[PDB]
Amino acid sequence: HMPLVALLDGRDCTVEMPILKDVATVAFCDAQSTQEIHEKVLNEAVGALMYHTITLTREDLEKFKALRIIVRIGSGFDNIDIKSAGDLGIAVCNVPAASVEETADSTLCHILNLYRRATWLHQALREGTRVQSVEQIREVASGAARIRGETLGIIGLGRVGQAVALRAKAFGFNVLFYDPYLSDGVERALGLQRVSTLQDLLFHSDCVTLHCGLNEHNHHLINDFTVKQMRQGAFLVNTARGGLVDEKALAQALKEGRIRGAALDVHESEPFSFSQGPLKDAPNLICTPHAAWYSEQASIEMREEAAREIRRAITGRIPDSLKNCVNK
Amino acid sequence: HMPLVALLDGRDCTVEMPILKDVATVAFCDAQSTQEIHEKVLNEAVGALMYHTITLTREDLEKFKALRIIVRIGSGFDNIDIKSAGDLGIAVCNVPAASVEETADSTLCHILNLYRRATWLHQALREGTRVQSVEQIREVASGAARIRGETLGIIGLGRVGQAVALRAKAFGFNVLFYDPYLSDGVERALGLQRVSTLQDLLFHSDCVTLHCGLNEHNHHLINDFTVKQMRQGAFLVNTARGGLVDEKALAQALKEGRIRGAALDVHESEPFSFSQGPLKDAPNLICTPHAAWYSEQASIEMREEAAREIRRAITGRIPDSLKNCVNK
Ligand SMILES: NC(=O)C1=CN([C@@H]2O[C@H](COP(=O)(O)OP(=O)(O)OC[C@H]3O[C@@H](n4cnc5c(N)ncnc54)[C@H](O)[C@@H]3O)[C@@H](O)[C@H]2O)C=CC1
Ligand SMILES: NC(=O)C1=CN([C@@H]2O[C@H](COP(=O)(O)OP(=O)(O)OC[C@H]3O[C@@H](n4cnc5c(N)ncnc54)[C@H](O)[C@@H]3O)[C@@H](O)[C@H]2O)C=CC1
Ligand SMILES: O=C(O)/C(Cc1ccccc1)=N/O
Ligand SMILES: O=C(O)/C(Cc1ccccc1)=N/O
Ligand SMILES: [Ca+2]
Ligand SMILES: [Ca+2]
């Protein structure tokens, strides 16, 4: 009895194999969608490993006859209808710890790139700009701002948010956060200021950074309405989920100068391109291809944890043996 | 009696005027060299304000008949033969406080850009790269590394170095420093590790960042010899002085992969260009046009301090009244 475990949206299973070699038949599908998956896998697969590049609706889930557990190789699971998955008897789990600090470090890099304009200054030199005089330095580096005394607003004070807050303090940022699902008192433990509404957050924050999961109640959390609530010349950073931001509203804000700059590692439609979308001709923009998470150590770590979860499921009882089940 | 005060390498004196209006005749020269300066200024100027774009040798200093004080609008004064200046009875002063944290923030941005590859990832998207799969993310973000447990080596633990150390700790960096002119015990106050030699520093450091002044004994401190002392795949960051690095040795190291990446805000010959010099075809390179210092608040601050120093000189006694004389 060697049940089938399938990596849906990937082609490499090397890291997972030594953890599943003796308890599972391991295959990959390199599929961007269900249509790309073989009937055999849909029919026989007892467990599934997936990243974020594929989405599983209830319809897509129904195509799995033997599937009993899904493990997201990552923390975000907005790409899975976990409630239905659970109704179908399919446990869904994630890997929340592997890339917390990598993601927090990327977030700070982006924040610092907006405040110090390092990436744009480098892009300009590549383009040929010559900066001889001090006058020119000020002109080309225009927009660069002193960080101390500035207020950083954190939306979602979880693992990454907390990691960001602690680093941000070391730069002299006054750190605020809005997280309506957290219990009373976390702000005291970490020496932070808390606000009760998103509007308060956006109103007092010079730089807004997103670190909340994408759920039923925060799609386009940043929109034409809430953008108007944001400070004039404010910064925006997103290393969480693209669906949190209406890129139409963000684009216009950037062109209008209502928002001085934005740094995005995630987008409404990924992969991102500078030639495709509302952000096409939008200025003062930094963008990275969902790589805030990445380091060799982290990638290996999350894949090893996911396989272990898969193994706990096959060898034990669902969902009692699971360490990171998000849909009990 | 309204003595002449001249801004040598600049054209704007607006910030200085309200501080000198009643005690000095203020003029500017917008000169990249002495040859560009009018005889009247060379003859009559009693005080001089200058940035870093002009250099004053003893020969250039001798062209000043009435000059009594020079104030560097900035901290670095390697562009002035201060010893000769003093022999000629000319006090030289600087402005060491204004852009400490700006410079430290830029330094961190660069360090984070090397470790997280944010600037290169953004450049790639601009170039058209499409990153659809996880495999592609790892490939394009290859070289991105986990920061915790890494060792940051600081050369020169002064104002900026200390500011960098404190921030760096917040990312999980193990921080070392080499500063042979500092007194016993500073390492204990700030919770840092100290080494006695440059070789030790370079040998234990995954990322090396420079924060020492340019003096008689550290030109090309980083050279073919000392580069060989650097760890394999090490990072290099420089926001201090260009003359500290032999760009020939750095280039070859980058091409050979002996150095994985370098981030430079200063250069042997400024202004810098990607089309001119040894770094011309050198890879894994980030470069900014000496803007680590810049913020509107800082620029105004240092100019106001410099004028005040000029005023202290005219209205008081040299060098007893001076706050920041570096060549007593
Ligand atoms: N770009 C990348 O490579 C990576 C992105 N991420 C993303 O970052 C996000 C945060 O990850 P973690 O901190 O590990 O998750 P977490 O579960 O530890 O933290 C989420 C926090 O956001 C809060 N939150 C949820 N909805 C909210 C709303 N509408 N307003 C305010 N706060 C809200 C929750 O109370 C929770 O404390 C995730 O959504 C994940 O998708 C995570 C890892 C890597
Ligand atoms: N790129 C920019 O916009 C800016 C650059 N800078 C540069 O950064 C450098 C540091 O500035 P601060 O920290 O304010 O100066 P500082 O005088 O406060 O610190 C200099 C430190 O370097 C140490 N040092 C000198 N020679 C050394 C050597 N051979 N090896 C090891 N350590 C050595 C000294 O002991 C001293 O502690 C300056 O040289 C300045 O030119 C400063 C401000 C802005
Ligand atoms: O966005 C996520 O859920 C991530 C990032 C990730 C993880 C694995 C592969 C790609 C991106 N969490 O780690
Ligand atoms: O390099 C320096 O000495 C600086 C940076 C600077 C200052 C004024 C104008 C340009 C650069 N110190 O602040
Ligand atoms: Ca502002
Ligand atoms: Ca290394």
Side-chain angles (χ1 to χ4, degrees), chain B residues 75-76 96 103 155-161 178-182 211-215 218 221 239-241 265-266 290 292-293:
Chain B
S75 57
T103 299
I155 301 173
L157 196 80
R159 300 171 181 91
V160 181
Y178 163 70
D179 192 337
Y181 306 114
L182 285 194
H211 302 287
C212 58
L214 181 60
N215 53 65
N218 61 8
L221 182 154
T239 57
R241 280 295 177 264
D265 184 67
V266 298
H290 203 141
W293 67 278

Side-chain angles (χ1 to χ4, degrees), chain A residues 2-10 12-31 33-34 36-37 40-58 60-64 66-82 84-129 131-134 136-138 140-215 217-227 229-251 253-257 259-275 277-280 282-316 318-322 324-328:
Chain A
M2 292 283 292
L4 178 62
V5 176
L7 169 69
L8 311 186
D9 55 340
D12 182 316
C13 299
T14 63
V15 178
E16 295 81 0
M17 282 305 311
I19 292 165
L20 300 168
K21 174 169 174 157
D22 54 323
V23 304
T25 303
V26 179
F28 64 83
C29 309
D30 200 20
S33 61
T34 285
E36 244 177 311
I37 301 174
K40 181 162 178 287
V41 177
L42 302 169
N43 293 331
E44 304 182 19
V46 174
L49 291 158
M50 50 179 286
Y51 295 94
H52 68 280
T53 68
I54 181 171
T55 309
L56 295 181
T57 65
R58 178 183 267 267
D60 291 324
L61 290 165
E62 283 166 346
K63 289 161 216 185
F64 290 92
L67 190 59
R68 284 252 294 157
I69 179 161
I70 301 172
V71 177
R72 271 285 295 106
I73 302 167
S75 57
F77 48 83
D78 53 284
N79 56 328
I80 300 162
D81 183 345
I82 62 168
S84 295
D87 290 337
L88 292 169
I90 307 183
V92 179
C93 311
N94 68 338
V95 179
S99 298
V100 176
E101 297 196 292
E102 277 83 354
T103 299
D105 296 346
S106 297
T107 298
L108 261 297
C109 188
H110 278 132
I111 291 168
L112 290 174
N113 274 315
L114 291 177
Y115 270 98
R116 307 308 309 152
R117 295 191 80 94
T119 291
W120 292 329
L121 289 160
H122 164 77
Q123 184 182 340
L125 290 174
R126 290 295 192 186
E127 291 174 3
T129 295
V131 188
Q132 184 283 318
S133 64
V134 169
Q136 290 173 285
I137 293 170
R138 298 175 181 142
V140 76
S142 189
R146 173 175 285 175
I147 288 172
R148 177 166 296 283
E150 286 271 312
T151 294
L152 180 68
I154 292 176
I155 301 173
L157 196 80
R159 300 171 181 91
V160 181
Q162 289 175 29
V164 169
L166 297 176
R167 284 153 177 77
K169 288 177 111 192
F171 292 84
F173 273 113
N174 174 39
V175 175
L176 269 67
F177 77 94
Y178 163 70
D179 192 337
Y181 306 114
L182 285 194
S183 58
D184 214 345
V186 301
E187 55 270 25
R188 312 298 269 275
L190 310 166
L192 309 178
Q193 217 197 118
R194 179 175 194 171
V195 296
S196 295
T197 67
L198 172 61
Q199 171 177 5
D200 279 313
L201 193 286
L202 301 171
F203 176 68
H204 291 102
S205 299
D206 299 304
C207 182
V208 176
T209 181
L210 304 163
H211 302 287
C212 58
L214 181 60
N215 53 65
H217 297 111
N218 61 8
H219 186 80
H220 287 190
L221 182 154
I222 298 301
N223 55 63
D224 281 306
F225 189 66
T226 52
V227 160
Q229 290 175 340
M230 294 181 66
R231 282 196 174 182
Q232 219 283 320
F235 284 140
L236 183 66
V237 178
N238 190 10
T239 57
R241 280 295 177 264
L244 299 168
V245 178
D246 185 348
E247 291 175 13
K248 291 177 55 174
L250 177 54
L254 282 169
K255 300 177 203 146
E256 290 179 4
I259 283 179
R260 195 196 289 286
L264 318 173
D265 184 67
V266 299
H267 307 82
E268 297 199 73
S269 188
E270 293 173 19
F272 175 81
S273 172
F274 273 113
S275 310
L279 302 159
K280 254 165 67 173
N284 305 130
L285 193 52
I286 298 170
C287 290
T288 48
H290 203 141
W293 67 278
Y294 177 76
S295 74
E296 180 170 9
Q297 292 171 253
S299 182
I300 291 167
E301 234 165 52
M302 72 169 71
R303 291 172 66 176
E304 281 170 353
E305 172 70 37
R308 284 193 295 269
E309 187 84 311
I310 291 294
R311 178 173 193 127
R312 287 188 283 266
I314 297 176
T315 296
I318 302 174
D320 322 313
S321 303
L322 310 187
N324 286 117
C325 181
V326 301
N327 77 329
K328 281 169 147 38

